[PDB]
Design a protein around this ligand. Structure first.
Ligand SMILES: Nc1ncnc2c1ncn2[C@@H]1O[C@H](COP(=O)(O)OP(=O)(O)O)[C@@H](O)[C@H]1O
Ligand SMILES: [Mg+2]
Lengths: 386, 51, 50, 69, 99
């Protein structure tokens, strides 16, 4: 019952970023329900700097009375914290001075003053003696980084957090960082790392400030189906007791997960379309909703063709509940992309599977990934000379 | 014990139910804990124990 | 430095609001113009009379 | 010159012939002592990664004390 | 030990960080603290924590003859450690009674 109380402070509220993202979408720009919830969070926390940015990017009408009322609260609260900081630095002790800035940094983060919060947190970090208190400040910066998707902030603070967890063996903080790392891995299309980090914390999840547990398991299932092999999926996801318990309350996610494993391809495609729309409205998965569904379709096509030497176009169409032409266009597109190891005999409508060696696939990446390395070396020498 | 020798005497009573929970929370952070551990019950199960 | 003012610098007129600001292994397949898979599947479920 | 680390040691390790013939079964009625020694000496040697995953700091040393015999 | 942290702060932190508070108050700065309680209650934990937070050197005086070579070759009286304490001022000299 005390699950949400265990999580880290909800500063910045990642729901606000999700609410802001929905308004960025043309479909949900005019949704009053989302607008009311975002405005309710803004009004409650007196997020004056966020109000200016919200109205500037979205081209809204600034309520002068509301903004002035909130700005006065921000000035009064900042003055109160400054007086507390002045009081602590002259009479009280260093721990009380540290708490004074932490409140000031927390308030600036709460009201959306990202630039002020980063400076204030850096000042607080400089004279914070306790190691865990330092690590919480890093987790604050990580949450700020995720709020604005500041890749430099997330990557820099992730390295700092990893170092802090090494010095003090805080396994509790280590589990939280994996959730933070996995969320960033989702945001940067690193589903292979996201699945590994999410599955390690599926039984140690306490990061309620980022997401609810059902949503975490929902994402954990999603990234697992695209990044795990069939044997790994069965041991970790299908037979995972922690995930299976949560899936009892999420019939759609369980239907999506088990349809591919149980080879119910017509069911899976219907569930994949549902996952698409959920992923389109998610601020984390939105840039990769096209990629994930395309990859998931490749997985389903490959899985059906993996165990059979040849399958007719009609059988593939019947299994997926689609037409023959749709399978033709999809298979041809993916085979040409080099993702499906099969070839189509359109005259007889037969798809014949191939077995290309891993050596060919390893050779191309060395050519590909090596070439990316060479340009950096080539370009770095260019910077060196002049 | 003569006044003026020791300027302040600070007592450290054995942790009560709430203080034991705080100590339990501090040291359990160094372990791989499954979610949902009811440390409050564990604190109740240790009457008259030290840190 | 000898900047290339000779070549007509076409006006930027770009979106300085962090249009992409991402670092992935991005490929051309994400940029193919097509409706969402939900629309594609929904446009085929009734094509079979279902 | 820098001599190999295993070199320059007046104390040698136990060879195969110097291994004592006393088995665990030869010892009777020290299950608590065997478990504590096993959990602190021979299990950390083979299961160091399991200790780190759980969060236990393996004990560097073990002091065995008691009445003689 | 929130109450204990506050009590030891006004006695070990305030005299070091703000000696002017006691001069204005007209009282001598505290110099001796006694932490008493059952074993394992955190007396050494708090005393070490204060020395770590006020940047005061923490010296544990157990009376061990193993550390006597570091204190001094004389070793006749325990006040010989004050030479090392003055060099590392502010310093907290801690003794724990095993009893
Ligand atoms: N109130 C407490 N909170 C957290 N840890 C404690 C507390 N009391 C004792 N401990 C733990 O007990 C260990 C030893 O306690 P110690 O302070 O040496 O006992 P004593 O106060 O009798 O000297 C420390 O490593 C510390 O982590
Ligand atoms: Mg003790």
């Amino acid at each position: 019952e005390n699950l949400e109380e265990e999580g880290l402070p909800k500063n910045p509220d990642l729901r606000i970023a999700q609410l802001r993202f929905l308004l960025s979408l043309p479909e949900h720009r005019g949704d009053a329900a989302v607008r009311d919830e975002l405005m309710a969070a803004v009004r409650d926390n007196n997020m004056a700097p966020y109000y200016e940015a919200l109205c500037k990017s979205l081209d809204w009408q600034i309520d002068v009375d509301l903004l002035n009322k909130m700005k006065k609260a921000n000035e009064d609260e900042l003055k109160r914290l400054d007086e507390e900081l002045e009081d602590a630095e002259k009479n009280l002790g260093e721990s009380e001075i540290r708490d004074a800035m932490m409140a000031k940094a927390e308030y600036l983060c709460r009201i959306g003053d990202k630039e002020g919060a980063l400076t204030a947190f850096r000042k607080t970090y400089d004279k914070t003696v306790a190691l865990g208190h330092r690590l919480d400040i890093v987790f604050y910066l990580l949450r700020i980084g995720l709020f604005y998707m500041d890749n430099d902030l997330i990557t820099r603070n992730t390295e700092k957090a990893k170092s802090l967890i090494e010095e003090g063996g805080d396994w509790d903080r280590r589990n939280r960082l994996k959730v933070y790392q996995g969320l960033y891995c989702v945001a940067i299309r690193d589903f292979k790392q996201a699945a590994e980090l999410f599955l390690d914390t599926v039984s140690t999840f306490t990061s309620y400030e980022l997401m609810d547990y059902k949503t975490f398991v929902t994402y954990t299932v999603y990234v697992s189906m695209i990044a795990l092999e069939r044997p790994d999926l069965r041991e970790k996801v299908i037979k995972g007791a922690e995930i299976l318990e949560v899936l009892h309350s999420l019939p759609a996610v369980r239907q999506y997960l088990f349809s591919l494993y149980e080879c119910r391809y017509s069911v899976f495609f219907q569930s994949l379309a549902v996952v698409e729309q959920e992923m389109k409205k998610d601020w984390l998965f939105a840039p990769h909703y096209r990629y994930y569904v395309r990859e998931m379709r490749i997985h389903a096509y490959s899985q059906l063709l993996e165990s059979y030497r040849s399958l007719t176009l009609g059988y593939m169409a019947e299994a997926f509940g689609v037409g023959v032409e749709f399978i033709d266009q999809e298979l041809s597109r993916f085979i040409a992309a080099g993702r499906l190891h099969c070839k189509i005999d359109k005259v007889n409508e037969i798809v014949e599977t191939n077995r290309p060696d891993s050596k060919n696939w390893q050779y191309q990446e060395t050519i590909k990934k090596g070439d990316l390395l060479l340009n950096r070396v080539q370009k770095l020498s260019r910077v060196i000379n002049m | 014990l003569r006044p003026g020798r020791i300027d302040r005497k600070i007592e450290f009573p054995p942790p009560n139910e709430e203080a034991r929970l705080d100590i339990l929370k501090i040291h359990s952070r160094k372990m791989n804990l499954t979610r949902g551990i009811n440390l409050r019950k564990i604190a109740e199960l240790m009457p008259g124990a030290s840190g | 430095d000898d900047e290339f003012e000779e070549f007509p610098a076409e006006d930027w007129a770009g979106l300085d609001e962090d249009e992409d600001a991402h670092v992935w292994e991005d490929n051309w397949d994400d940029d193919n113009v097509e409706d969402d898979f939900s629309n594609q599947l929904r446009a085929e479920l009734e094509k079979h009379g279902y | 010159d820098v001599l190999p680390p295993e070199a320059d040691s007046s104390i040698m390790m136990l060879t195969s012939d110097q291994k004592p013939d006393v088995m665990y079964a030869d010892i009777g009625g020290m299950d608590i002592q065997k478990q504590e020694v096993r959990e602190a000496v021979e299990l950390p040697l083979t299961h160091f990664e399991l200790y780190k995953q759980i969060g236990i700091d393996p004990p560097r040393g073990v002091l065995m004390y008691g009445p003689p015999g | 030990l929130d109450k204990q942290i506050k009590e030891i702060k006004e006695v070990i932190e305030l005299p070091v960080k703000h000696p002017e508070l006691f001069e204005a108050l007209g009282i001598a700065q505290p110099k001796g603290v006694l932490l008493y309680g059952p074993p394992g209650t955190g007396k050494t934990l708090l005393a070490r924590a204060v020395a770590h937070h006020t940047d005061c050197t923490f010296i544990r005086v157990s009376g061990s003859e193993l550390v006597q070579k570091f204190i001094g070759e004389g070793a006749r009286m325990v006040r010989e450690l004050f030479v090392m304490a003055r060099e590392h001022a502010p310093s907290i000299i801690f003794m724990d009674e095993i009893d």
